[PDB]
């Protein structure tokens, strides 16, 4: 069990499945999402990369470096690709899984979805998640989630735009989206995303600093002590 | 052009047009600049009230250098620029509202960034729109091209207040605003300019990016078809 | 000291109290708050610095002290403990900065937040860097331009308040359930890293204080401030 790809009209569906149901962002999952974006980009008809979970879990992030680098690179590709990456959340989004939804162009979630940053419990900081989470929600919702470690409901997450829309069925919301999206030329989506990159204060240096700090932190005695147990 | 009405502590600049699109023409952009000159020379004027007519606020540009320069003045002028929206605000018209100190709207108002449909990016609108709403609401509007209701625009502060009558809200805000010295308005606005990460260099980037895109093959094709 | 300190399980409570009820931030009160944080930091069991007001006022701002105020807010952003501003009533001017600089703002429904500085020809220079980080640009700008207070419910819409509750002490006790599971070294690492996640720096504080000291000596401020104090 891993990333299942299904082609639908104008959509490439990338369904995260896992043997344990945690839908962790293993190197295998990150490569598979990377190759899904490759497939989606190579199709002149594909307008959306639909990112989703299964069994009440969207994604719980990296399991316990090389992972952090490919996670950061994959989130950066989401920000530049000339197609709409739509995170369809139906359940648990935790840690890196929050960053994976936050990096998408749109987050569409069901009412039962929860979003959390439990990293501080293991002596970690979600270094890799935060630049893209802060861009989406502002500094305070991201900070309050990191500090508290408590999950936030989809309706709550919609108040600070971590969720773009709470709906009964995210697949139906993606089909609604396609009506307006199929009218846009992929070159314009690419230009639109390139210009928005310059509309925020974070850079390629932010990614580098995020990875440096994440690896420093995971080697610290408190993170070491907690992760072992 | 721009119909101008002097009221107590207020200069009302009403955008009017034959087609009802209330497009920002070079002549409309010139008149709004002159309205601001009038507003600034009147020691008693505290508000430049910007509004549309006939269910349309403003539908953007018909140029980009004047539009950027006018929005920049809105952020500097030592008076409150209040955009009173009662209907449609699209593309450049969203930027003219977003650059105002306050956006006061009726429930029937809608805000949209339809630029992508014609192969464009709203380059000139986004620096000021992103400062007002944050990154994600601006980005979702531009990617989707779909209009947002005034109530929804109020959730991410594209609208400051949804009210039945914006002229009544401007009269209510005059109660506290008349008590402030124009020099304090000028100092507040200047200081707040340093409280965000955008500069005057953002304005030249926007203009260069828009002028490149407007001559791009997708934009040339779609715009030729829109006008023919 | 104008500040009452009380030790509770995992908590240091710093209650602002004043005979004039304004809970002003004087040199003496800012020093007491800095010493309180020194005490919270020296106690390994202390996880929260609980900052609150009394008798319907949280804090109405400053009584130089501007540098002390800016340095205290900066400490709040790095200290390896959770600073929680429990608001029950009036937070004005500098008082808004003192709350917005806390990790969490927990308020009762009757609470109001305002930036009346433009009334005395001032700009809330020292408040705005931490306020804008918390609420974004527009809510902070509308508050300063209008000078009109905002209810706790409306302040929660733009995260100036993290939660509106009937009892902020009960909400702090609820926070402790998860906070006590975190190592203080992690809180400090989290806060340091979050410092790198915004565009403001140490330079922003010095700019803020230079601008405020210029404005307090400007003709409009000198006249209105003189009018007020006389």
Q: Give me the CATH number covering residue C214.
A: 6.10.30.40
Element of type H or E holding B205? helix B200-214
Interface of B to A at Cβ within 8 Å reads: 116-117, 119-121, 123, 126-127, 130, 134-140, 142-146, 155-156, 197, 205, 209, 213, 216-219, 222
> What is the C-alpha to C-alpha distance for residues A126 and A223, in angstroms, rounded to an integer?
12
Distance to chain C for B219, nearest Cα, Å = 33
> What is the C-alpha to C-alpha distance for residues B59 and B88, in angstroms, rounded to an integer?
7
Alpha helix stretches (DSSP H) within C43-180: 65-76, 94-100, 128-135, 137-146, 152-157, 168-179
Residue C4, strand partner residues: C15
Q: Which residues contact B79 (CB under 8 A, 6 or more apart)?
A: B39, B40, B45, B46, B47, B48, B182, B185
This PDB structure is determined at a resolution in Å of 2.0
Q: How many CA atoms lie within 13 A of A108 on its CB side?
A: 23
> What is the C-alpha to C-alpha distance for residues B95 and B123, in angstroms, rounded to an integer?
10
> What is the C-alpha to C-alpha distance for residues C144 and A149, in angstroms, rounded to an integer?
33
Interface of C to B at Cβ within 8 Å reads: 118-119, 121-123, 125, 128-129, 132, 136-142, 144-148, 157-158, 199, 207, 211, 215, 218-221, 224
> What is the C-alpha to C-alpha distance for residues C214 and C108, in angstroms, rounded to an integer?
36
Q: Is the CB of B146 less than 8 angstroms away from the CB of A84?
A: no
**B1 and B106 fall within a common domain:** yes
Nearest to A210 by CA among A132, A115, A123: A132
Which residues of chain B lie closer than 8 angstroms to C207, CB-CB?
194
> What is the C-alpha to C-alpha distance for residues B126 and B146, in angstroms, rounded to an integer?
16
Output Rg (C-alpha) for chain C, integer angstroms.
17
Structural domains in chain A (count):
2
Q: Is the CB of B143 less than 8 angstroms away from the CB of A198?
A: no
**B137 and B215 fall within a common domain:** no
Q: How was this entry determined?
A: X-ray
Rounded to the nearest 10°, the torsion over CA C71, C74, C79, C83 is 100
Strand order across the C150-151 sheet: C57-59, C90-92, C112-114, C150-151
Which residues of chain B lie closer than 8 angstroms to A185, CB-CB?
119, 218, 222
Element of type H or E holding B175? helix B166-177
> What is the C-alpha to C-alpha distance for residues A36 and A28, in angstroms, rounded to an integer?
12
> What is the C-alpha to C-alpha distance for residues A143 and A155, in angstroms, rounded to an integer?
18
Structure tokens at C75: 């400490």
Nearest to A91 by CA among A49, A59, A61, A132: A59
Element of type H or E holding B131? helix B126-133
| Alpha carbon distance, N-terminus to C-terminus of chain A | 27
In a domain, B58, yes or no: yes
Chains touching B (3+ CB pairs < 8 Å) = A, C
Distance to chain B for C122, nearest Cα, Å = 7
Q: CA–CA distance from A86 to each of A75, A108, B130 (Å)?
A: 12, 7, 21
Residue of A nearest to C159 (CA): A140
**A33 and A132 fall within a common domain:** yes
Are A57 and A23 spatial neighbours (Cβ–Cβ below 8 Å)?
A: yes
**B20 and B125 fall within a common domain:** yes
Are C92 and C114 spatial neighbours (Cβ–Cβ below 8 Å)?
A: yes
Q: CA–CA distance from A19 to each of A22, A54, A55, A211 (Å)?
A: 8, 11, 11, 28
CB-closest option in A105, A136, A137 to B143: A105
> What is the C-alpha to C-alpha distance for residues B199 and B195, in angstroms, rounded to an integer?
11
Which residues of chain B lie closer than 8 angstroms to A136, CB-CB?
135-136
- DSSP letters for B59-128: --B--HHHHHHHHHHHTTSSSEEEEEE-SEEETHHHHHHHTSSEEEE-TT-EEE--GGGGT---TTTHHH
In a domain, B126, yes or no: yes
3-state helix, strand, coil in chain C (%, to 5): 50, 20, 30
In a domain, B174, yes or no: no
User: Which one-letter DSSP state was computed for residue C12?
Assistant: E
Q: Could you give the 3-state DSSP secondary structure of residue C90? A: strand
Which residues of chain C lie closer than 8 angstroms to A159, CB-CB?
157
CB-closest option in B102, B157, B184 to C118: B184
3-state SS, C189-215, equals: HHHHHHHHCCCCCHHHHHHHHHHHHHH
Phi and psi at A132, nearest 5°, equal -80, -30
Strand order across the B47-51 sheet: B2-7, B10-15, B47-51, B80-85, B102-105, B161-162
> What is the C-alpha to C-alpha distance for residues A168 and A159, in angstroms, rounded to an integer?
17
**B142 and B36 fall within a common domain:** yes
In a domain, B177, yes or no: no
In degrees, rounded to 5, the angle at the alpha carbon of residue A24 between the alpha carbons of residues A19 and A26 is 95
CATH classification of the domain holding B154: 3.90.226.10
Phi and psi at C62, nearest 5°, equal -75, 150
- DSSP letters for chain A: --EEEEEETTEEEEEE--TTS-----HHHHHHHHHHHHHHHH-TT--EEEEE-BTTEEE------HHHHHHHHHHHHHHH-SSEEEEEE-SEEETHHHHHHHTSSEEEE-TT-EEE--GGGGT---TTTHHHHHHHH-HHHHHHHHHH---EEHHHHHHTTSSSEE-S-HHHHHHHHHHHHTTS-HHHHHHHHHHHHTTSS--HHHHHHHHHHHHHHHTSHHHHHHHH-
Tell which phi-psi region holds residue C89, choosing left (phi > 0), alpha (psi between -120 and 50) or beta: left
Q: Could you give the 3-state DSSP secondary structure of residue C169? A: helix
**A53 and A1 fall within a common domain:** yes
CB-closest option in B116, B156, B197 to A201: B197
Neighbouring C-beta atoms of residue B84, cutoff 10 Å: 26
**A215 and A123 fall within a common domain:** no
Q: Which residues contact C24 (CB under 8 A, 6 or more apart)?
A: C2, C18, C59, C60, C61, C62, C63
> What is the C-alpha to C-alpha distance for residues A177 and A171, in angstroms, rounded to an integer?
10
The residue to which tokens 């917005």 are assigned: C100
Q: Could you give the 3-state DSSP secondary structure of residue B29? A: helix
Q: Is the CB of C104 less than 8 angstroms away from the CB of A144?
A: yes
In a domain, B11, yes or no: yes
Q: Is the CB of A195 less than 8 angstroms away from the CB of B126?
A: yes
Q: Is the CB of B183 less than 8 angstroms away from the CB of C118?
A: no
**B34 and B88 fall within a common domain:** yes
> What is the C-alpha to C-alpha distance for residues C167 and A12, in angstroms, rounded to an integer?
49
Element of type H or E holding C113? strand C112-114
Are A98 and A118 spatial neighbours (Cβ–Cβ below 8 Å)?
A: no
Structure tokens at C100: 């917005």
Q: CA–CA distance from B113 to each of A185, B94, B122, B138 (Å)?
A: 16, 8, 7, 9
Are B100 and B74 spatial neighbours (Cβ–Cβ below 8 Å)?
A: yes
**B84 and B56 fall within a common domain:** yes
Which residues of chain B lie closer than 8 angstroms to A198, CB-CB?
205, 209
Residue of A nearest to C179 (CA): A148
> What is the C-alpha to C-alpha distance for residues C138 and C126, in angstroms, rounded to an integer?
17
The residue to which tokens 């989470």 are assigned: A133
Nearest to B56 by CA among B105, B104, B109, B95: B109
Neighbouring C-beta atoms of residue B106, cutoff 10 Å: 18
Structural domain including B199 reads 182-228
Which residues of chain A lie closer than 8 angstroms to C182, CB-CB?
120-121, 149
CB-closest option in B132, B185, B187 to C137: B132
User: Which one-letter DSSP state was computed for residue C6?
Assistant: E
CB-closest option in B139, B197, B219 to A196: B139
Are C162 and C105 spatial neighbours (Cβ–Cβ below 8 Å)?
A: yes
Buried/exposed code over B45-56 (b: 16+ C-beta within 10 A; e: otherwise): bbbbbbbbeeeb
In a domain, B172, yes or no: no
Phi and psi at C52, nearest 5°, equal -145, 170
Neighbouring C-beta atoms of residue C182, cutoff 10 Å: 21
Strand order across the C11-16 sheet: C3-8, C11-16, C48-52, C82-87, C104-107, C163-164
Neighbouring C-beta atoms of residue A221, cutoff 10 Å: 10
Chains touching A (3+ CB pairs < 8 Å) = B, C
Are C47 and C180 spatial neighbours (Cβ–Cβ below 8 Å)?
A: yes
**A35 and A137 fall within a common domain:** yes
Buried/exposed code over A30-64 (b: 16+ C-beta within 10 A; e: otherwise): bebbeebbeebbeeeebbbbbbbbbeebbbbbbee
Are C164 and C156 spatial neighbours (Cβ–Cβ below 8 Å)?
A: yes
Residue of B nearest to C147 (CA): B176
Element of type H or E holding B166? helix B166-177
Which of C166, C194, C219 is the C-terminal boundary of a domain? C166
> What is the C-alpha to C-alpha distance for residues B117 and B126, in angstroms, rounded to an integer?
17
> What is the C-alpha to C-alpha distance for residues C25 and C51, in angstroms, rounded to an integer?
13
Nearest to C189 by CA among A96, A61, A214: A214
Phi and psi at B105, nearest 5°, equal -130, 155
Q: How large is the angle between the packed helices B135-144 and A130-137, nearest 10 degrees?
A: 80
In a domain, B186, yes or no: yes
**B121 and B207 fall within a common domain:** no
Neighbouring C-beta atoms of residue C8, cutoff 10 Å: 14
Q: Could you give the 3-state DSSP secondary structure of residue B213? A: helix
- What number of residues does chain A have? 229
Nearest to A33 by CA among A71, A68, A88, A63: A71
The residue to which tokens 């953002």 are assigned: B202
**A15 and A98 fall within a common domain:** yes
Nearest to C119 by CA among C32, C14, C31, C223: C223
Nearest to A145 by CA among A126, A165, A172, A171: A126
In a domain, A92, yes or no: yes
Distance to chain B for A191, nearest Cα, Å = 7
Q: Is the CB of A188 less than 8 angstroms away from the CB of B119?
A: yes
Which residues of chain C lie closer than 8 angstroms to B102, CB-CB?
142, 145
> What is the C-alpha to C-alpha distance for residues B163 and B154, in angstroms, rounded to an integer?
11
């Amino acid at each position: 069990r891993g990333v299942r790809l299904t082609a639908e009209p104008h959509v490439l569906r990338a369904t995260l499945t896992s043997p344990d149901g945690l839908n962790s962002l293993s190197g295998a999952a990150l490569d598979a999402l990377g190759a899904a974006l490759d497939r989606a980009e190579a199709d002149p008809e594909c307008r959306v990369l639909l990112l989703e979970g299964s069994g009440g879990t969207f994604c719980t992030g990296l399991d316990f470096g090389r992972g952090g680098a490919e996670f950061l690179a994959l989130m950066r590709r989401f920000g530049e690709t000339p197609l709409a990456v739509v995170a369809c959340v139906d359940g648990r989004a935790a840690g890196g899984g929050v960053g994976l939804a936050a990096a998408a162009d749109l987050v569409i979630a069901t009412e039962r979805s929860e979003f959390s940053l439990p990293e501080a419990l293991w002596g970690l900081v979600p270094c890799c998640v935060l630049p893209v989470l802060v861009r989406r929600t502002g500094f305070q919702p991201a900070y309050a989630m990191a500090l508290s470690t408590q999950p936030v409901s989809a309706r709550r997450a919609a108040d600070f735009r971590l969720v773009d829309e709470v709906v009964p069925d995210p697949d139906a919301a993606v089909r609604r989206l396609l009506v307006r999206l199929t009218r846009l030329d992929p070159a314009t989506i690419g230009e639109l995303k390139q210009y928005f990159r310059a509309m925020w204060f974070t850079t390629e240096d932010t990614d580098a600093f995020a990875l440096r700090e994440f690896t420093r932190l995971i080697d610290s005695p408190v993170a070491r002590r907690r992760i072992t147990d």
